[PDB]
Amino acid sequence: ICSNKVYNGRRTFERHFNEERHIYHLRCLGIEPSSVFKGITKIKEAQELWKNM
Amino acid sequence: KRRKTEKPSLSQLKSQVPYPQIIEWYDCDARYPGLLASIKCTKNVIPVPSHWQSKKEYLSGRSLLGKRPFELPDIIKKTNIEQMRSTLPALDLDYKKLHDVFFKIGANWKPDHLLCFGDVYYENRNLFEETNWKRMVDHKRPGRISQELRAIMNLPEGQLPPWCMKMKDIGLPTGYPDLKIAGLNWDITNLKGDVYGKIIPNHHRNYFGALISFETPEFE
């Protein structure tokens, strides 16, 4: 979801879930922030998840 | 191989779940993920303590270095054996005294913290600070300021806090609509000591089990 970005660690990527830019991609994408969407990777699936919301 | 690559995506798993935020990335390799999501997300189940997947044997804690050795429950500390025997780097006691401490004095006594249905103790946690926290949410209330924080604030007695003037222009706290403060909504002559204001509630049994008497077993 983030610029097809690269991360060098799993702790770091687990920290990506709470971040400025990651939440900007979600919220500006129309997928609202915080803790339901944490496990997101691809942009597509969380769209149907947000339709479920 | 094929079974390892056969796994559905965690977001595909979220939709099956009524409380999707509990499921985590590692649930993808759950051998029965649709079932494990239902169990883990069932109403009253309490998720596994997360200290697993760490190799630290659950306590490496730096905080463990700074934990207090012990503190007597104040009711037992009343028994004075603290002075009789020095535990830190003979004391004749009365049977009636000790017995009454546990029973007469300490029947209704209960530890202040305990824990709740789903409380689980993670390594970095320390209950004591949360005990002083819960006790503090109890003692301290708005409109009152202790003499220590008052001295640090350098506010002399009889003088209102500096936010009473900005509270005159801005208005009462949105969180405390019933709050009263001397000089504004509340009588300045009732200003006393550490309390410059108090919340005035606008709201104004037996629970079928009322014992109506309390009698402890006597030792004698």
Next chain:
Amino acid sequence: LSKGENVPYTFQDEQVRSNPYIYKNHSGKLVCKLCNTMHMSWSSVERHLGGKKHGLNVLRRGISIEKXXXXXXXXXXXXXXXXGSVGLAIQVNYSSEVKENSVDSDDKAKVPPLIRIVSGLELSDTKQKGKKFLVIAYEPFENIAIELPPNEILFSENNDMDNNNDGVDELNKKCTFWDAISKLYYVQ
């Protein structure tokens, strides 16, 4: 190994220290307040100091510490040709020491006329547009333009041998001459 220095306890409420870091806590052990590491002997303390760990915490702590007369001149357009195509050449003439006798204070006086290709997409009136102009400018005199319908003419390919005095641009150095002695600006 201590070199006779006295390291006060942490609780003694701080004589200048060699390193104001290694202390002794309430107990007898030695600690690095930054690193939060316990050390049994002064030799272990020196291993800590000579170790990369402590140094990294020192750098982190340092990072924490930082934290116009408008006169139309006279142009002389003329269809030229060389080899192998066709190009345009303009001959612009300037004053004959008539009015330039009152201004000679080396204020860009050494600066020769300048040319630029402008798109008609922007005009004071903004009515019609769609062609280029070979504008030529000099401080006192008024600007001058020449319409260039042809998409490209005389647009050469490495005329000289790549010498880099940009002047203003490749266009000016590449194909302009300023006879300053006679006040004649040629452009092709």
Next chain:
Amino acid sequence: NTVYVGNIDPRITKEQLYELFIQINPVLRIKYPKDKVLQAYQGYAFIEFYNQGDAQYAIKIMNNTVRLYDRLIKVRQVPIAKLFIKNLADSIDSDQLVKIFNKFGKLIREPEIFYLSKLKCAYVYFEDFEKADLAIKSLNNQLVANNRITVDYAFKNGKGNAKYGDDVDRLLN
């Protein structure tokens, strides 16, 4: 919700902060850091209220109000198109770039001029992927200031993917 507080004396403790701000609004949580390099307090805290109404209220009434240990207490409240352009002319000013790309699209930031190889290049930030497509379509392989410039997407590999149009559309929305 959460408010930043700063210019705090390390002698100010957690109970003192709590007792301080409960006077303003109810305090949900207090994160008041404790240094593992100084074993004390680093002199700034974070107070999470029960809502941004009480948060902003405490920001208004609390800022530049309480004096603790003679030091004043401070309170403060707590993805775009990018085109790489190569072979620019030395006579091209950043403001001239702004003028050139304004007609195609609004710029979220200013261009970035840098030199590769000698080779003048710039990054241009557009607010719209479609307006970026306009500046690309018209300005790609074009001659400005008598110099041929190339206009494409800057690398992240390069911008302009399929998911990029999708999410940039949303960030526009």
Next chain:
RNA sequence: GUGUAGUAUCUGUUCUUUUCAGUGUAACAACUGAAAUGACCUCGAGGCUC
């Protein structure tokens, strides 16, 4: 105040064949096998490259 065998625990130190596939792992890790040589381009990265 000693010797024989043996153990645990700090701390210091340091990063092991670039890759691929299998086992393995919650994912790692770890283990098991093989091995490119040559040419070119832009700023260690990159190649529907040959």
Next chain:
RNA sequence: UUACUAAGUCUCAUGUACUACAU
């Protein structure tokens, strides 16, 4: 205004306890 996490493996040394076993 700094929005709270680092050691691991190997190697060769130092720190400290310990376990059977003998005078």
